[PDB]
Amino acid sequence: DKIKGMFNPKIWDKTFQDGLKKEIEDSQPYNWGTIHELVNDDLLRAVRKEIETEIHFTKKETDIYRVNQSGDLANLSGLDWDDLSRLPNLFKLRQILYSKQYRDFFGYVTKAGKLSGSKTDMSINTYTKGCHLLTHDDVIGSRRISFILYLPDPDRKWKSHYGGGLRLFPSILPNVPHSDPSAKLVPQFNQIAFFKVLPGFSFHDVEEVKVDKHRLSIQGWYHIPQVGEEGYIPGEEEAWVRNNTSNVLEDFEFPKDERNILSFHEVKHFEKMLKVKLSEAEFTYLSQYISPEHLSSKGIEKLQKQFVENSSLQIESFLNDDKSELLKKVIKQKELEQECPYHSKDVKAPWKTAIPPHKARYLYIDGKEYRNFQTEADILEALNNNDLPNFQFTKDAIKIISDASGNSRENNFDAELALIDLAVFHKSTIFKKYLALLTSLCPVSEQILIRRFRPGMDFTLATKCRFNELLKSNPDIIDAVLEGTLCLTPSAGWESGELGGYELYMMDDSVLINDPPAWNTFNLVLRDESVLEFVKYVSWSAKSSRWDVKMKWDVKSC
Amino acid sequence: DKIKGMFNPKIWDKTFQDGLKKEIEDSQPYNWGTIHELVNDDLLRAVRKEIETEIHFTKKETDIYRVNQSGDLANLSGLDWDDLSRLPNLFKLRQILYSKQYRDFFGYVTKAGKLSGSKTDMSINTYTKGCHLLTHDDVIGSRRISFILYLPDPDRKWKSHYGGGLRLFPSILPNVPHSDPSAKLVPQFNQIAFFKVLPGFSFHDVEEVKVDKHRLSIQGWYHIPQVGEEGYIPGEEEAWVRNNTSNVLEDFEFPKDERNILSFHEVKHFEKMLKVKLSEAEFTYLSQYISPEHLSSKGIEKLQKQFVENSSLQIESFLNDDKSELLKKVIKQKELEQECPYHSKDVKAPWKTAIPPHKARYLYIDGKEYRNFQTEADILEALNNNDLPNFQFTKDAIKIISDASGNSRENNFDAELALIDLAVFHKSTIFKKYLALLTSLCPVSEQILIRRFRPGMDFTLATKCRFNELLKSNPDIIDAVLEGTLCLTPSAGWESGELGGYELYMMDDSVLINDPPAWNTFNLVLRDESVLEFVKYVSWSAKSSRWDVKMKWDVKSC
Ligand SMILES: O=C(O)CCC(=O)C(=O)O
Ligand SMILES: O=C(O)CCC(=O)C(=O)O
Ligand SMILES: [Fe+3]
Ligand SMILES: [Fe+3]
């Protein structure tokens, strides 16, 4: 048997097979398996060499990933699955993996039943330093089992600190993965990792590659049997796709994309002004935080003109010298002298973790009562007991925790307190008057968040604004959300190192803004329904978190 | 001189006059004066006797006062200012008070200028136990100087503990009086108190009469001179009335009549249900606070029917036995064993004082950061820095104050903590689902306040609901405010003693609800634009404060 002989002879042994089936049954957080030294060593070495000589990889980055790919439609990479003339060993590899012999073995140990021999579905990718793939479940089309065969250097050990681990996530509920993974597989040459595709459950990701090494892999899927194949059931595939394609789940997303309506006093002030002038006292108040260049008569005129022309502002050195210096000092001190929580269970007041991880992950201060979501019950409690932001109470709580601890260089809340003070400034009636002056728009609601995006952990994905549905019938209220981001990231290397963390606004060139983290910048965007936004995953190589203050307002023409 | 001789001879003495003018100039909180032994003693004694024999007084109560009056249009009291046949001494008294001789004296010492001799304007009233007159400024029509001549028993001293003091209020700003008075005059027979009417400033009230005594007085006004009189200036009166008749001041009112919009999760739950059923788990949650009789299938059906027919509910024994007993214990303990603040400066977290006192006075917990409004600056700071309610943070702050003090029978916050727990129950998603079930209305916003109305201090006046102006164009949102009051007043005697504190709803029989304070009642009223509501001034004779929880929701047909 020329097929059987191209695999490790152990895989044809009944005792081995039963042992592996048991391993898979007993695995966590959902059923998965691995086999070491799977394929004939000479064959797999020859495949690696063919790939190196015949395939050219191209970096592709999206919100969800950065991966060096070879699957371009025109086959300019050199990989054409319809014509493997220059890769005969790869041809042999695909043939043996989709053989009846292997499929019968593989379907048995995974309890997946019959698998398609003809619907071959493989991809060849490399992950180099900074490459990653964020949380997802693989539930697409007729996929039945996911597999990844790893081909890093056969004569060197791939090490845990290299990154590139396959990580698997437990679930709080179906389609609601826990923020932190519970298993990690470190890939080696000729090792295969695999799992039955599980709608709602099979959440996994590829840990960023943290060093200058090349993680080469062949990712594939076994599919539901097709017409004329063993195990084919007419209608099975159609039913599977339908049941996986066909908004209760938004309840499990935190923070909520919700704004609170402003006071009668506030709205009157904005209306009165826009039906042109700030008092000297009001300018004095603004000058406590904002640079003089953005408060001068001609500075304001320029900003007003820019907003009219672009429906956005990108302001540099937004905060004045005093506040910029204060914030830089306290943020740098926290970055360099304090320990950051790197698991949601370890996050303490005033911080929360954005969830679920197939949508976002980051730390935030919202001014609401402390939440740490580890169980379904924790989430249900929050939903039954909505509370509203209160930044002064949050400040108060911080002082009491701090005074109990001693307020040292290791545990002080100087950064959080300074950032909350900044949030309170932006919550002030006078700030919103200034915002109204710049935009000729009348804020009627607000949400303010302080965010920290940790290296190797944090990101958001491309999403649209959420309109205040109670305000939809109001003809004065514009069909848009005004969104501000005050970036306070003190480290460098973001652009040159491609460290992620950039704020991206695009139309659904479609890119409106692509802004790597910087220090003391203020972005303002009037978002209509279609505009997409995200903050890119922050690389482990970043020398600080991305820190910012995120602000959102419903607005009326005034 | 028959006129001069009917007054104390001292008032015609230049040295006396100048001394009095100086007293008035140097007085606080606004210029006022008093003269002792003003009138011929025999004359004033004869006037008192005529009043006792010839005038019948009738108790009249409104939101602002309770006073035994004699000014009925038909003159059934026996007092007819056009025919004093049976009161010739009263005739003589009016004549001398409006004489040129007296007006020249009175106008001089008050720096009020000329006064009308013909536009006589007097009223005769008695204040008996429980009678009072709340804060007001006397600024009506052509009134120039206010005076009150007191005629209690001439042969007994009126004592401070009798009450019935004339109290004068300082101002934070024009038309914004301080909550607490800064001067009090204790009336005696033949004593006159007076002040120039001052738009924006001349705020005064009559302290409740606290004992079974009869405070008889003649209140009057001197007016701007009329045509043909000394000092008449054509157009003066018209200009005065115009400048006093012709909404910035709502900024100074606390608490704000403002509701916060509910979460997306909440509104979805109500919509889903009303487009009929609560789960067993939801009933279990409700049963923690609410009596079984209001959660049963037929109990609910009855309430639903009552609300359909009346657009209101009046529920007795609302809370279950466990919670009723807990709340009664802690409220009674606070009433009987702890000291209540009786000046706004003495009110501490978590309590605030409703202001200004010509509109309302009471203590409330709103869950917002602590405020104590003693200056204009204090108010302006709050207005520039709006914050939102957070009951858990309020609870947290209470524990830290309590643990610093020792948590004794004298200083514990057991009542406040139990009341906040109750507020949190009513803030729960499941409670609002139950509310939606009872009413077939869909809450979309909320405000919850805990209120304490102290004996001898606290009240509100008749006002309409305030619509959420941002929601006016929404056709689904009903032009009404749903309003709940959970009364938790543990003392008795309210109705029999006429102790005030009643909750009054009336159409602008017009009375919808007149409900004296009781224990564990829940009133629910769907208020359209016109419906007026107030809580009547609580008598010093009440044996506890009125305690309640006030709830307001915007609602849609769902
Ligand atoms: O390379 C891996 O380990 C897994 C890749 C993956 O999950 C995917 O491409 O869907
Ligand atoms: O009787 C008093 O002392 C004052 C009465 C009063 O202020 C009034 O009737 O307007
Ligand atoms: Fe995958
Ligand atoms: Fe008065």
Side-chain angles (χ1 to χ4, degrees), chain B residues 486-554:
Chain B
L486 206 174
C487 196
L488 294 166
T489 304
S491 61
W494 293 93
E495 243 184 311
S496 67
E498 297 177 66
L499 299 181
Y502 55 83
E503 180 174 51
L504 198 292
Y505 281 94
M506 59 184 280
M507 292 174 290
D508 195 17
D509 182 36
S510 66
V511 177
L512 302 170
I513 290 167
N514 185 344
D515 197 353
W519 180 259
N520 192 197
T521 57
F522 187 74
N523 287 344
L524 188 70
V525 177
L526 187 65
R527 306 179 64 163
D528 71 25
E529 341 207 348
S530 68
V531 177
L532 293 158
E533 174 279 336
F534 71 95
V535 169
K536 178 67 187 164
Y537 170 78
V538 177
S539 172
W540 274 106
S541 293
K543 297 177 277 297
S544 78
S545 293
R546 174 195 169 95
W547 295 77
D548 70 32
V549 183
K550 165 68 63 183
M551 321 169 197
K552 298 174 184 179
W553 306 273
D554 296 294

Side-chain angles (χ1 to χ4, degrees), chain A residues 411-455:
Chain A
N411 278 341
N412 74 71
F413 291 89
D414 292 343
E416 288 91 341
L417 292 163
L419 285 162
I420 293 160
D421 283 345
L422 177 60
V424 169
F425 171 77
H426 288 280
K427 167 165 58 78
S428 75
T429 300
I430 294 165
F431 175 75
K432 280 164 274 190
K433 288 189 76 168
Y434 172 75
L435 183 69
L437 180 61
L438 299 189
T439 61
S440 297
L441 298 171
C442 226
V444 295
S445 74
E446 77 183 5
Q447 182 180 210
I448 300 159
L449 299 174
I450 299 154
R451 308 186 301 179
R452 180 186 187 169
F453 295 81
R454 298 159 291 185

Side-chain angles (χ1 to χ4, degrees), chain B residues 123 125 127 133 136 138 143 148 150 164-167 193 195 204-206 215 217 219 221:
Chain B
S123 72
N125 299 102
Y127 287 69
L133 173 56
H136 64 287
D138 272 18
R143 295 170 181 177
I148 313 94
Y150 299 101
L166 173 69
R167 303 192 295 190
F195 48 92
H204 59 287
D205 88 347
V206 177
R215 180 206 198 258
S217 60
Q219 157 80 248
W221 291 275

Side-chain angles (χ1 to χ4, degrees), chain A residues 65 67 123 125 127 133-134 136-138 143 146-150 164-167 185 187 193 195 202 204-207 215-221:
Chain A
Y65 67 73
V67 187
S123 72
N125 299 102
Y127 287 69
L133 173 56
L134 301 174
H136 64 287
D137 60 17
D138 272 18
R143 295 170 181 177
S146 304
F147 71 88
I148 313 94
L149 180 59
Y150 299 101
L166 173 69
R167 303 192 295 190
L185 185 51
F195 48 92
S202 52
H204 59 287
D205 88 347
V206 177
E207 178 194 40
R215 180 206 198 258
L216 171 66
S217 60
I218 301 165
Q219 157 80 248
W221 291 275

Side-chain angles (χ1 to χ4, degrees), chain B residues 36-298:
Chain B
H36 304 264
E37 304 170 329
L38 175 69
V39 177
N40 182 88
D41 189 75
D42 285 343
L43 174 60
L44 198 65
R45 284 179 180 261
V47 169
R48 176 169 167 278
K49 287 290 176 57
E50 284 179 349
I51 292 165
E52 287 178 336
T53 300
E54 306 294 338
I55 300 174
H56 177 74
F57 297 88
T58 299
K59 175 182 73 187
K60 182 161 196 288
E61 180 164 323
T62 63
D63 58 348
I64 292 163
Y65 67 73
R66 181 205 301 173
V67 187
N68 308 312
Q69 292 179 155
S70 62
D72 74 285
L73 189 61
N75 304 313
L76 300 178
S77 67
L79 178 66
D80 180 354
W81 290 112
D82 291 330
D83 186 353
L84 296 171
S85 288
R86 301 205 53 83
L87 305 93
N89 292 105
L90 177 63
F91 182 99
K92 179 65 172 182
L93 181 61
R94 180 183 58 186
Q95 184 176 68
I96 69 170
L97 288 169
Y98 287 90
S99 65
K100 181 177 153 57
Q101 296 98 314
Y102 191 78
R103 286 185 286 106
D104 286 347
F105 156 74
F106 212 49
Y108 172 69
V109 302
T110 56
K111 296 159 85 181
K114 296 283 180 287
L115 307 166
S116 180
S118 67
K119 195 167 174 174
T120 61
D121 185 1
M122 289 161 64
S123 72
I124 305 177
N125 299 102
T126 76
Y127 287 69
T128 51
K129 191 174 179 179
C131 288
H132 57 276
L133 173 56
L134 301 174
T135 315
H136 64 287
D137 60 17
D138 272 18
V139 185
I140 297 293
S142 55
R143 295 170 181 177
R144 178 158 280 183
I145 303 172
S146 304
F147 71 88
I148 313 94
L149 180 59
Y150 299 101
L151 292 82
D153 192 339
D155 298 302
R156 299 256 258 145
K157 185 208 181 295
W158 193 267
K159 296 165 183 175
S160 180
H161 81 273
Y162 292 177
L166 173 69
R167 303 192 295 190
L168 318 178
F169 295 77
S171 285
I172 305 167
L173 303 90
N175 285 118
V176 191
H178 282 270
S179 190
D180 307 289
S182 65
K184 177 164 69 60
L185 185 51
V186 177
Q188 305 295 156
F189 180 83
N190 208 187
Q191 182 166 188
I192 194 165
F194 53 91
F195 48 92
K196 187 175 188 175
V197 174
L198 288 182
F201 292 105
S202 52
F203 287 103
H204 59 287
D205 88 347
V206 177
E207 178 194 40
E208 180 190 351
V209 172
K210 288 182 277 184
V211 298
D212 189 19
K213 299 286 177 180
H214 285 241
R215 180 206 198 258
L216 171 66
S217 60
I218 301 165
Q219 157 80 248
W221 291 275
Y222 292 96
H223 290 259
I224 300 171
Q226 306 293 111
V227 64
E229 299 189 311
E230 199 171 7
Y232 172 65
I233 299 170
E236 178 180 31
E237 176 170 343
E238 287 76 12
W240 175 264
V241 176
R242 202 206 313 113
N243 295 344
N244 293 338
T245 315
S246 67
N247 318 304
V248 192
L249 295 171
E250 71 197 345
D251 282 4
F252 304 102
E253 297 175 18
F254 290 85
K256 304 297 175 191
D257 202 351
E258 286 172 352
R259 295 168 294 277
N260 288 115
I261 56 170
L262 303 177
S263 68
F264 289 124
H265 167 85
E266 291 172 80
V267 177
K268 279 199 293 174
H269 258 109
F270 317 143
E271 283 174 9
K272 188 171 187 285
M273 191 193 68
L274 288 178
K275 284 186 288 180
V276 286
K277 210 177 72 60
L278 268 31
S279 74
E280 286 172 45
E282 286 169 335
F283 276 117
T284 300
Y285 178 83
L286 296 163
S287 77
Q288 298 301 298
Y289 273 90
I290 302 169
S291 290
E293 66 262 16
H294 315 302
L295 302 173
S296 73
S297 50
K298 292 291 165 189

